Amino acid sequence: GPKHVLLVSEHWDLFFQTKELLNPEEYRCTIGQQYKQELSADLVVCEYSLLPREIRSPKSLEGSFVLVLLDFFDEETSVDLLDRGFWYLIRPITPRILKSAISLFLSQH
Amino acid sequence: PKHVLLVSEHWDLFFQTKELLNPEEYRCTIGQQYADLVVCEYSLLPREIRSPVLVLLDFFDEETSVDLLDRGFWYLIRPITPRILKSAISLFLS
């Protein structure tokens, strides 16, 4: 069965282009426009702008992992994501970067 | 404590980071070349090695990034402050 990746983003073009770079037998990608998890989600990739300020990805996690996409560098923003348990990428984020980051993340986890 | 090795010439970064990590939980040391966690400058990372590591980048290059991720390496791009590094370290090790 393929790993299921939910992208929470309004960047539809990023979604489609990243999806066609991931092998469907290994990864199934779906997109939403508001932060959530799904029962089948192995990984949620969420725009910082759609990620609620108050949520955490806790140490003894039983839900999905979440990787966060940031438009910008800001020190306390970064410190804050890291202490809340989210790793992230800062833009520029190309379909190629996102594909390899998704594969890397799910292979290490 | 977890052993964290920093491979970097950024001595200010080393000391200020180490100072933020509680020495009971983390033991940080420095290395001039390439541990529970290695943080390696891109400029001192081998280049044909794959990951068994967090790589510090001076700047953004799409091809470098793609390459590191496929080789198995996560990265931070500068600016990289001691508070950022201390938190990245704690995150990776938890």
Side-chain angles (χ1 to χ4, degrees):
Chain A
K3 301 303 179 78
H4 175 221
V5 176
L6 177 65
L7 178 69
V8 181
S9 185
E10 278 176 13
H11 294 274
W12 289 91
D13 54 340
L14 178 61
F15 178 60
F16 281 118
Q17 292 183 45
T18 297
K19 184 180 168 181
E20 81 200 348
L21 295 171
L22 284 155
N23 185 329
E25 284 183 356
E26 282 142 48
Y27 311 94
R28 178 173 64 87
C29 314
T30 62
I31 190 175
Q33 269 76 53
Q34 196 170 357
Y35 177 73
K36 72 196 286 182
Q37 301 194 339
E38 295 174 339
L39 284 173
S40 63
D42 299 285
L43 176 73
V44 186
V45 179
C46 186
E47 295 294 349
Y48 187 67
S49 291
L50 289 173
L51 184 75
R53 275 289 284 288
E54 78 276 10
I55 71 163
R56 307 181 60 69
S57 173
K59 297 181 174 51
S60 303
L61 179 67
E62 304 279 349
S64 322
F65 301 107
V66 168
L67 166 72
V68 164
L69 302 192
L70 265 168
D71 288 336
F72 61 79
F73 173 70
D74 171 66
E75 172 178 38
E76 303 283 10
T77 302
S78 296
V79 172
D80 176 72
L81 283 168
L82 295 162
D83 294 351
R84 286 157 63 196
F86 308 102
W87 183 235
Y88 56 82
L89 311 171
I90 300 175
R91 281 186 161 87
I93 292 158
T94 61
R96 287 183 64 222
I97 297 179
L98 185 55
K99 180 287 188 171
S100 315
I102 287 169
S103 313
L104 171 52
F105 195 106
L106 285 169
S107 72
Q108 285 177 344
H109 289 102
Chain B
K2 305 299 181 61
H3 177 215
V4 174
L5 176 61
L6 179 53
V7 182
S8 182
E9 292 179 286
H10 281 248
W11 330 107
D12 270 342
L13 180 64
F14 171 60
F15 285 123
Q16 293 188 33
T17 294
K18 173 209 275 236
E19 190 186 343
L20 301 174
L21 293 166
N22 168 352
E24 308 297 351
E25 296 244 306
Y26 318 85
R27 171 170 74 90
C28 310
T29 56
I30 186 163
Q32 38 165 13
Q33 62 162 231
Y34 187 114
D36 294 329
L37 175 56
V38 183
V39 179
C40 188
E41 296 287 347
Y42 184 76
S43 76
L44 305 171
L45 177 80
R47 194 188 308 193
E48 302 268 306
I49 206 145
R50 296 190 52 95
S51 195
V53 195
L54 174 66
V55 173
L56 302 191
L57 281 165
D58 279 345
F59 60 80
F60 177 72
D61 177 63
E62 180 185 9
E63 297 291 333
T64 312
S65 304
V66 179
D67 174 58
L68 286 169
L69 297 166
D70 295 334
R71 287 164 64 202
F73 300 104
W74 297 106
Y75 56 82
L76 293 172
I77 296 179
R78 292 195 139 80
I80 302 180
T81 68
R83 293 210 299 153
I84 288 171
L85 199 49
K86 133 208 125 270
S87 279
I89 291 175
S90 314
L91 177 72
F92 271 53
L93 284 175
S94 56

